[PDB]
Design a protein around this ligand. Structure first.
Ligand SMILES: [Mg+2]
Length: 256
């Protein structure tokens, strides 16, 4: 059977809701929909957002109000839903949904970002580590994994408009690029680069300069599967026409 999964850093759900998010949701009709940066507290959401017809909905808010948060809409509910890696300082910021769909585990992650300081960076990298360890334990037990969401890092030079002036800014630091190397070398696949080899493919553009209309952007949103499972991924694309956020959605399509 074909399964369509979408992943989107919505940059505040309320905000994307005001730009026809429901219209588009109903149009595309994916089997699972992963969301990052809900920003709003779930018990505050317009009811039509929390109660979408045909979809059970899962919300994982941060402690801070107005901040972070992840969400998942799925036609068929999972066996269970985890909201953490098991290390405290990472699990309390509503960044983690690990949902068990029997055939695979679905990681909906909103990774942090290492900007403004070194501690911020340290936390991002330690987060990366805690995630890698978590996904490996699950994979080593013979489970198949799908990781999607905002990784906050463009992998290679081919993954952003301006690499040269950015390699000392967080998002493209060699350290951050080095991790994605490690991550892959542990047995995981950037699904999109399985089918697309072109440059100029982005998932985020700065609102601040109308960067999208020029396509001066970054690829920060990824779908990852474990190598043993790549045979079953049919499509992996970027829905770059879909407006409403500073990120656009990206999609995965799998078999059985
Ligand atoms: Mg954002």
């Amino acid at each position: 059977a074909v399964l369509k999964i979408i992943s989107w850093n919505v940059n505040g759900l309320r905000a994307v809701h005001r730009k026809g998010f429901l219209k588009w949701f109903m149009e595309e009709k994916p089997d699972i929909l992963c969301l990052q940066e809900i920003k709003a507290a779930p018990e505050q959401l317009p009811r039509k957002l929390r109660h979408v017809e045909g979809y059970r909905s899962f919300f994982t808010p941060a402690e801070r109000k107005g901040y972070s948060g992840v969400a998942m809409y799925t036609k068929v509910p999972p066996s269970s839903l985890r909201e953490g890696f098991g290390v405290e300082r990472f699990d309390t910021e509503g960044r983690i949904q690990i949902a068990d769909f029997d055939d695979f585990l679905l990681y909906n992650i909103y990774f942090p970002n290492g900007k403004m300081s070194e501690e911020r960076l340290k936390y991002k990298l330690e987060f990366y580590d805690a995630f890698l360890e978590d996904v490996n334990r699950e994979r080593d037990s013979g489970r198949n994994v799908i990781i999607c969401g905002d990784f906050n890092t463009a992998h290679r030079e081919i993954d952003l408009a301006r690499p040269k002036e950015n390699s000392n800014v967080s998002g493209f630091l060699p350290v951050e690029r080095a991790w994605i190397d490690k991550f892959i070398e542990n047995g995981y696949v950037d699904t999109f680069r399985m089918f697309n080899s072109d440059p100029g493919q982005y998932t985020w553009w700065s609102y601040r300069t109308r960067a999208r209309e020029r396509n001066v952007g970054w690829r920060l949103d990824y779908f990852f599967v474990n190598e043993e499972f790549k045979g079953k991924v049919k499509r992996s694309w970027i829905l770059s026409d879909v407006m409403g956020s500073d990120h656009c959605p990206i999609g995965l399509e799998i078999e059985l």
